[PDB]
Amino acid sequence: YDYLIKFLALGDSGVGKTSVLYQYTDGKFNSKFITTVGIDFREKRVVYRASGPDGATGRGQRIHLQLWDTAGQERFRSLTTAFFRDAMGFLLLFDLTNEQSFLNVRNWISQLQMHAYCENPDIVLCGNKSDLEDQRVVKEEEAIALAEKYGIPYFETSAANGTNISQAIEMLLDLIMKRMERCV
Amino acid sequence: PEQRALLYEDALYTVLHRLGHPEPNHVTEASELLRYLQEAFHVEPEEHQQTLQRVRELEKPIFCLKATVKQAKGILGKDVSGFSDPYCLLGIEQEEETHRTQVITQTLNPVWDETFILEFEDITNASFHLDMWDLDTQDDFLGNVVLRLQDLRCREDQWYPLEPRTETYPDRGQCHLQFQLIHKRRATSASRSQPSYTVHLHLLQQLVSHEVTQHEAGSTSWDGSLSPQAATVLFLHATQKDLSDFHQSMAQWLAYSRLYQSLEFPSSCLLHPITSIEYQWIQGRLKAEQQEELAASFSSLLTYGLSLIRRFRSVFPLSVSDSPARLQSLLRVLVQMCKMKAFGELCPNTAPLPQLVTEALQTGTTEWFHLKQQHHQPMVQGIPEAGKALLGLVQDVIGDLHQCQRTWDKIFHNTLKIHLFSMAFRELQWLVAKRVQDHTTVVGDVVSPEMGESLFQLYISLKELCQLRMSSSERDGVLALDNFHRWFQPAIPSWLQKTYNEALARVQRAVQMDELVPLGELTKHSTSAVDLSTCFAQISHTARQLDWPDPEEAFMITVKFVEDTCRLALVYCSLIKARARELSSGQKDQGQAANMLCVVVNDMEQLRLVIGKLPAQLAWEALEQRVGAVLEQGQLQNTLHAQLQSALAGLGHEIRTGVRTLAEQLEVGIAKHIQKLVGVRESVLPEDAILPLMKFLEVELCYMNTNLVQENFSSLLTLLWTHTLTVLVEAAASQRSSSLASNRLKIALQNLEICFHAEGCGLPPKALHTATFQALQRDLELQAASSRELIRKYFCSRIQQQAETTSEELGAVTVKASYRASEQKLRVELLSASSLLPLDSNGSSDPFVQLTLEPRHEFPELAARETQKHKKDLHPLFDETFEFLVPAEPCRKAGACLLLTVFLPLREVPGLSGSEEPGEVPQTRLPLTYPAPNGDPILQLLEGRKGDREAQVFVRLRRHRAKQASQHALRPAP
């Protein structure tokens, strides 16, 4: 490869970061998943250099992505802060189905800025399960308000159909590229 | 006080009245005892003379004899038979001085055991007088006992014989007696103002105190029972007041016990009196006074000893080299004290010895922990000071439990069956848990790196403390230090950082302090590689030292350490690449840069070995047996094995690029040597053109094997072999039409195969082949090297195809062939040709046979035989016999055939294929494979050689016959 990036898909429990990394690594999706015990470790050999040289498809630079599916249970939150030490980019995933995941986003960022690798953490906030419209209790306006207050980019991806997860992760990888071209 | 004077005076009044010659255990000399008593009392001789003057003026006590007379036996029978009851007449001559004991009938002797005093004045001038008179129920006389009193002392029980008064009866019998001598009511104020027993106790206390202070300057190893003259001066004022040994024994015990509570003497000297209360307590009785004093002294010695074994870390520490012995002696006088009837008199203490000993041990352990905590600097507020205080405290408790496990455990268990270590460890894990738990509570969830290191040292010390549990019979149910690892959970992300910040420290300095030179000439790496081994072993040692018993978190830390080791691998790779760049900016030598790249890739290979050892170092096999329960399938291989494999692949990059750089250089050399080898003239032998390429490959790869590990050298060999096979394949086509350089390339492939095989700098490519190798060697062996060899190969392939041909449409000629090994003549009988085709386009067959031996250059001097011509015959009859003069040496060679121009085997002919000479000639029928316009690739390589004419004649006639046979070829129906 040419770069090695350590994403951490980190969030609460029931949010489903495992399904997001499953639908980014391949197309397979599971109806029901058990809670993640310990942390997982996904791998992806993309060639993007931030994202494809034609805009979304082509040969850029070989990016080996580690995609750590950290636990959302509180029993594996304290020790998991050791993995934040060199964690370029963080995938804050919440669910539009429940609002507690929405209010915990600010607490999650507050925990992340004290454990960031570089001078400022990289965040893309993804409001997953955006296709299931029957239980959506989170409005777009509040989400974009929290995005603009904290300066973080936002997406409305979903894992049940696989839409927009790839674009969200691609532009987050792009953000990490802007930060490396900012750091030097 | 003043009693020290007055008691002193009493001593004189009891010691200058000492009368009688010396005993085996008592001495009679005033001057020595007086000077010893003055030395012990610290009294100057003028006061001694004043006291002697003051004791002369006191009136002398009237002396008397404690006449204890017992029964008499052994008297001869001259009286009436039976009823022998004599009476004794006690008297002393120099009521008033005589007495007659009443007689008892039906006895051999009266037994009454009473004693009456007999007042006398002088000892050396008076004789003992005692006579028997046996009244008869005549009053016959018996013997008497007469002895001088100078040999009469105290404690003189003996059997004395009665002296015969008349010679008519020789024996008078032997009577048991007990001789004492006591004083009357004496005149000293010292023994009469106070009771005699308490002044005896005080006087004996004075002698024991001055004995223990005069035997040594201090008192710790006084071994005797008493001084001899002190024992004598004790023995008087012990029997001269009508006193038995009973009050003397209790007085000895009281004085010794109160002295022990006053100043220390070794308590084995307490063992001699205590058993006396064991020996003499039941037969005697005490009044209401001094019995309570005996009980009070029992209780006071018990309390003093229990305050001693409560504080056994101070009064018996393991530094005076007899602490267990002195402690065991103290318990050995604590037992054999509760082991008599005399401990039934203790009202202050009824509860028994092991329970109260454990109570004192418990209180002493608690107080010792408290004083140790106050010792370990608690007066300064602050968290790191309390942390180092707790570290020192737990180290001291480890030391105390260690010395309680070896030494003090057995001496408490063998005597009174008390397990010191179990209770001590229970208490000192509770009192330490309640300190470390509160310390870690006020730590909070934020942990400083120095604070994390402090908690790490506390963690390993407490883990040692819990390790001591399993050597004490499984303390369970009182668990207060189990799960102590919970409180250190906030400190885990610091340690796994700090350990990493330790490890990343070492690998930062290791490349910094190393110039990457080969570590000697026996191994191939640098000090960075052995530093890797030590650093990764330190990481695994930290992981083992932690040993987290919780499963999922232990898996989580193991993944953390695996990513730390892989990240350190990538980091170290970047540092050695940067260090090689930094050195290459320093020097500009090609050889220095080459060997620098070499030592870098051996370091990478060593790191590959370390990473391969990581599943054994971090013990994933013992991990997956406990974290495979609640996890998912494939997760263990993904989180742990997959990043390790990616680290190995990232080592493969710049292992297979550092090797690839040298491989590119050497492949450029090999390719340019091959291209300059084909550029040499073709008029030179194929043995001197191989020399430069061969010596270059040999010397470069054979210097480079000593500079590289065998595994990386094996990879370099495989890459070089693949590249030189590719080069030789692409160079096998750029050759001239004569193709006589094909033998040069065959020699090249043979030597390149044999130079990759020579041991020491070549590794055998005999098990690992690739299709390019066999394809190239076969294609170029068929390319090499002369026209005749190609004709022979064509004839071999054509007869192999003819043997594979079974179709009868092309023509079947029936012949007989016999080779003779004794007549040299080949005999051929041609009979008939069957199932033929017309040799003319009109439809007329023309079977006429030229029986040639082919190839023509293989048979240069022979006249071929021919048969009669035939016209329009589908089954012509030849049936002719012909002889051929040819030796077996050209016939047995490959490619030799008998061709019938209208083949058949000539090396496999009957008579030469391993069989006998044919007496009867066999059949041999082969179908004719006509020349084809679609020729084999051999013909265009004959046609490259135009200098020779025979091969050109062969290929032109072959093309002519192929085009002529195509006109007579019958196309099959679809």
Ligand SMILES: Nc1nc2c(ncn2[C@@H]2O[C@H](COP(=O)(O)OP(=O)(O)NP(=O)(O)O)[C@@H](O)[C@H]2O)c(=O)[nH]1
């Ligand atoms: N309909 C729908 N369901 C989704 C979507 N994303 C996730 N889910 C479902 O939500 C659950 C998510 O599971 P999971 O990834 O384990 O959630 P998590 O427990 O918060 N993450 P972790 O396993 O790391 O603890 C699964 O039932 C998944 O099917 C989505 O976009 N649409």
